[PDB]
Amino acid sequence: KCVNFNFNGLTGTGVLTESNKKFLPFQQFGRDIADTTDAVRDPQTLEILDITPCSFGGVSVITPGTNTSNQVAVLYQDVNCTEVPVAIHADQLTPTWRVYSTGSNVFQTRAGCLIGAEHVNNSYECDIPIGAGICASYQTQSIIAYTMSLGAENSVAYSNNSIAIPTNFTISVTTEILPVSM
Amino acid sequence: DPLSETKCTLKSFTVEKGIYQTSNFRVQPTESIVRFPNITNLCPFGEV
Amino acid sequence: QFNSAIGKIQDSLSSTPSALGKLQDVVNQNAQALNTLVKQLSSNFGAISSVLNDILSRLDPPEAEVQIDRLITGRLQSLQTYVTQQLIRAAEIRASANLAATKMSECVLGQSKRVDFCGKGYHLMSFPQSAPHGVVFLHVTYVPAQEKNFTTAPAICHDGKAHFPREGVFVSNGTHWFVTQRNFYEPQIITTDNT
Amino acid sequence: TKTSVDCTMYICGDSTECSNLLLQYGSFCTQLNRALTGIAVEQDKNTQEVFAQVKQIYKTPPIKDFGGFNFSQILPDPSKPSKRSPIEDLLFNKVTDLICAQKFNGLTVLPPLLTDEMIAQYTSALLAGTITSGWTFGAGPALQIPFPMQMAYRFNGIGVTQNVLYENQKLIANQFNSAIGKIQDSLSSTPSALGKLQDVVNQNAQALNTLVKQLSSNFGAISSVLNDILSRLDPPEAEVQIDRLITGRLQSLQTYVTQQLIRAAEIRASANLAATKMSECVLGQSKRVDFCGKGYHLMSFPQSAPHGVVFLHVTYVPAQ
Numbered sequence: 006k007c008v009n010f011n012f013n014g015l016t017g018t019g020v021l022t023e024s025n026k027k028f029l030p031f032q033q034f035g036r037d038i039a040d041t042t043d044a045v046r047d048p049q050t051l052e053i054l055d056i057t058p059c060s061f062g063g064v065s066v067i068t069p070g071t072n073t074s075n076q077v078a079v080l081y082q083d084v085n086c087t088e089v090p091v092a093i094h095a096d097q098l099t100p101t102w103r104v105y106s107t108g109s110n111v112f113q114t115r116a117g118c119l120i121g122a123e124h125v126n127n128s129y130e131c132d133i134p135i136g137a138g139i140c141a142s143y144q145t146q147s148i149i150a151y152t153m154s155l156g157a158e159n160s161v162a163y164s165n166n167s168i169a170i171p172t173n174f175t176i177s178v179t180t181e182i183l184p185v186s187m
Numbered sequence: 188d189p190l191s192e193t194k195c196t197l198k199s200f201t202v203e204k205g206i207y208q209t210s211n212f213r214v215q216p217t218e219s220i221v222r223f224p225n226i227t228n229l230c231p232f233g234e235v
Numbered sequence: 236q237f238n239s240a241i242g243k244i245q246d247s248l249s250s251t252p253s254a255l256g257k258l259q260d261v262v263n264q265n266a267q268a269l270n271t272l273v274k275q276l277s278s279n280f281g282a283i284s285s286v287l288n289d290i291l292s293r294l295d296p297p298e299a300e301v302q303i304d305r306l307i308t309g310r311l312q313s314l315q316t317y318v319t320q321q322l323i324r325a326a327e328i329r330a331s332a333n334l335a336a337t338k339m340s341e342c343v344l345g346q347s348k349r350v351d352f353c354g355k356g357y358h359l360m361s362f363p364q365s366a367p368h369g370v371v372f373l374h375v376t377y378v379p380a381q382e383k384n385f386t387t388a389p390a391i392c393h394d395g396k397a398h399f400p401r402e403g404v405f406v407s408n409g410t411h412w413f414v415t416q417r418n419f420y421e422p423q424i425i426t427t428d429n430t
Numbered sequence: 431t432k433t434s435v436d437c438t439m440y441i442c443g444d445s446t447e448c449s450n451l452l453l454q455y456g457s458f459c460t461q462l463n464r465a466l467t468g469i470a471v472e473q474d475k476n477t478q479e480v481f482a483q484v485k486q487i488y489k490t491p492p493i494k495d496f497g498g499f500n501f502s503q504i505l506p507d508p509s510k511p512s513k514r515s516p517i518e519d520l521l522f523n524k525v526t527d528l529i530c531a532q533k534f535n536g537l538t539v540l541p542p543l544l545t546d547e548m549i550a551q552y553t554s555a556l557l558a559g560t561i562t563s564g565w566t567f568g569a570g571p572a573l574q575i576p577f578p579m580q581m582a583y584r585f586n587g588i589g590v591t592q593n594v595l596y597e598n599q600k601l602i603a604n605q606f607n608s609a610i611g612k613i614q615d616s617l618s619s620t621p622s623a624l625g626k627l628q629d630v631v632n633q634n635a636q637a638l639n640t641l642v643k644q645l646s647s648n649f650g651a652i653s654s655v656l657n658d659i660l661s662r663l664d665p666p667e668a669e670v671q672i673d674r675l676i677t678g679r680l681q682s683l684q685t686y687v688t689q690q691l692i693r694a695a696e697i698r699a700s701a702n703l704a705a706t707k708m709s710e711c712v713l714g715q716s717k718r719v720d721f722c723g724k725g726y727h728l729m730s731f732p733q734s735a736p737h738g739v740v741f742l743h744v745t746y747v748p749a750q
């Protein structure tokens with residue numbers, strides 16, 4: 006349980022669990038590579054307990070232009086689909102809790118958990134990049150998430166005695182813009 | 188709501204199409220516990 | 236074709252609003268940096284107030300000094316940060332300007348054979364246009380179209396001797412063989428002058 | 431690697447008093463976040479510019495008959511689930527709790543927009559295009575041509591007549607196959623080949639490790655632990671300790687961000703060079719001396735590498 010603790014003045018916050026650390030009999034608490042308290046020994050029962058900070062992460066909001074619509078999609082970065090906040094009962098510091106946060110369209114990606122967008126089996130050009138090959142777009146009156154398509158399929162009719170030669174041509178004009186000064 | 192948080196982050200009342208990083212979430216603690224040694228003898232400050 | 240293509244450019248620029256985003260980004264970044272510098276003057280940095288005049292009008296010099304040095308340090312740090320970002324941005328802008336100068340010299344003052352350097356396709360010529368804090372190039376390129384199907388051979392055997400094309404390629408529609416240039420279909424009879 | 435740093439968590443963490451004191455220090459955290467986000471976006475821009483050179487996905491015919499040229503070692507391998515060429519996964523194996531601690535200190539790593547499979551697909555499309563159509567697919571519609579005829583064209587490109595190739599086709603194919611075979615052995619035997627790719631990873635990891643290590647410095651305070659300061663002093667004397675801790679941590683963050691900006695600029699220059707090399711050596715034949723290998727350029731083949739790209743330059747060298 007995500008609770009505070011006080012071990013002889015060792016104040017902190019986190020989740021206490023069982024530890025497999027081979028603590029020596031004279032040892033009190035361990036530490037990590039970052040030189041922070043990782044495990045502790047209970048002063049009363051002499052039991053070694055692991056310390057892990059409560060779950061956390063960044064939050065990103067996916068939205069089209071406000072001139073277009075008002076719906077949004079929320080992506081919880083590097084958070085498993087199960088541990089996403091389901092209840093807002095004084096257990097999260099972000100009051101922007103989703104209208105359901107569950108039962109709704111919920112997609113789990115390699116970039117985190119995406120809530121508020123409907124997965125589809127099609128593939129279009131990338132519109133809003135999400136990460137790990139997943140893009141999002143506003144289609145129709147709704148927000149959808151899909152896998153980006155690299156391009157149209159093609160196959161040249163290769164043979165060892167066949168060639169192709171143009172007969173017409175086109176004159177094309179294109180533009181290029183380069184900053185020169187500030 | 189998250190859209191208003193985005194507007195607060197951008198310091199504007201209009202938001203262009205895109206993905207924006209607003210803030211971070213964490214699970215708030217439920218209760219607090221205290222673990223202390225089981226000894227009860229009182230220190231001899233009266234003598235000193 | 237040239238006139239139609241040059242006519243379409245104005246409509247393409249007028250329709251699309253985000254055409255000059257590359258030029259707009261520099262202006263936006265500089266304006267944002269200046270705005271941040273201006274806004275940073277309203278920070279206490281641990282002092283009683285962010286105003287020097289009221290601090291000097293309310294406290295004695297021996298402690299006004301210890302109130303003021305904090306503001307001095309904070310403001311100096313802000314200036315240092317702003318100058319560093321400006322230096323990095325100027326370096327990248329210089330790189331872009333060097334690229335633009337090279338493109339001018341090699342696409343406008345001559346014809347280039349480097350692929351994709353001057354437009355997409357086979358480069359013909361370029362025209363420069365001036366924009367605020369930037370430049371715009373109009374690359375004219377040759378694009379093949381309407382390809383066909385042919386049977387080809389590496390060499391032609393005649394009189395016990397092998398013959399190779401001088402500057403073309405051997406093709407046939409199915410019964411009769413010809414020699415034609417590679418980038419345009421222009422069949423011709425195979426003689427001893429083109430082989 | 432794209433990294434994101436939680437400014438408040440790194441400096442303060444869970445202490446509201448530290449956040450309140452940080453509030454009066456200006457909008458430094460927003461500046462740091464904006465710079466880091468710019469770098470992260472530039473990374474994907476670099477990758478897209480280097481690899482998304484073509485808009486179509488060409489495919490190799492099932493019958494691999496190219497007049498003696500082999501191409502087995504660089505074409506995708508259907509058997510492997512990753513669908514990578516033997517050289518590609520050979521390269522992917524050369525390049526190799528701390529992550530948990532970095533995450534717990536407020537430092538995270540964002541995933542790239544393009545997965546490795548997508549990049550391998552792009553390289554396979556480029557290979558198929560350059561094999562079945564020569565340089566035509568890079569300037570318009572892809573026109574097929576037998577591979578020996580394309581080799582004759584490229585021989586004409588460097589000043590040698592076609593009959594030389596048509597009369598030494600077997601020897602040329604054998605030499606090409608042997609060189610391609612020896613490339614794999616050269617990569618496998620020497621583990622120091624991917625030094626340029628290893629150095630970037632080493633530098634980034636070491637900078638992140640230094641940032642993590644800086645969290646255990648007093649900077650003149652009584653302790654380097656926030657809770658110990660808070661759980662031992664009343665506010666008006668705790669403030670003068672919190673302030674110096676904050677100043678030290680802010681200095682560390684600023685230094686890290688500046689170094690990252692400079693490193694990103696250098697990486698962007700390298701990526702621009704790589705994109706130019708792709709366009710001029712893979713999509714065509716280059717006459718610039720030593721731009722694509724040493725010798726007389728004939729053709730090039732790209733291969734994907736972790737956070738990079740590998741070019742195989744085929745050149746013509748006189749002898750005897």
Ligand SMILES: *[C@@H]1O[C@H](CO)[C@@H](O[C@@H]2O[C@H](CO)[C@@H](O)[C@H](O)[C@H]2NC(C)=O)[C@H](O)[C@H]1NC(C)=O
Pocket residue numbers: 172173174236
């Ligand atoms: C090559 O392209 C040109 C233009 O793209 C073709 O000319 C067109 O021919 C049709 C049929 O008569 C006309 O209706 C169009 O008005 C023409 N366009 C122009 C711009 O003049 C031409 O037919 C193509 N094929 C060739 C020249 O063999």
Ligand SMILES: *[C@@H]1O[C@H](CO)[C@@H](O[C@@H]2O[C@H](CO)[C@@H](O)[C@H](O)[C@H]2NC(C)=O)[C@H](O)[C@H]1NC(C)=O
Pocket residue numbers: 408409410411
């Ligand atoms: C392939 O090219 C040959 C070139 O000669 C074509 O033969 C000519 O066809 C026209 C139209 O029928 C005749 O008027 C000429 O007299 C033919 N030339 C000769 C030398 O006989 C032929 O039609 C083309 N197309 C095919 C063979 O399908």
Ligand SMILES: *[C@@H]1O[C@H](CO)[C@@H](O[C@@H]2O[C@H](CO)[C@@H](O)[C@H](O)[C@H]2NC(C)=O)[C@H](O)[C@H]1NC(C)=O
Pocket residue numbers: 494500501502503607611
């Ligand atoms: C040339 O291509 C052929 C197939 O078209 C390859 O033949 C086999 O390739 C596998 C791949 O490792 C080898 O394990 C087999 O031993 C090869 N067959 C024989 C009979 O040796 C061939 O390897 C390719 N050339 C090269 C140099 O790899």
Ligand SMILES: *[C@@H]1O[C@H](CO)[C@@H](O)[C@H](O)[C@H]1NC(C)=O
Pocket residue numbers: 085086087
């Ligand atoms: C976390 O997500 C994975 C899917 O990526 C799932 O298999 C696993 O069960 C989840 N964890 C828990 C505790 O449910």
Ligand SMILES: *[C@@H]1O[C@H](CO)[C@@H](O)[C@H](O)[C@H]1NC(C)=O
Pocket residue numbers: 162382383384
């Ligand atoms: C050429 O012939 C092949 C073989 O059928 C075909 O696949 C291809 O589409 C043809 N190309 C054109 C331009 O007609």
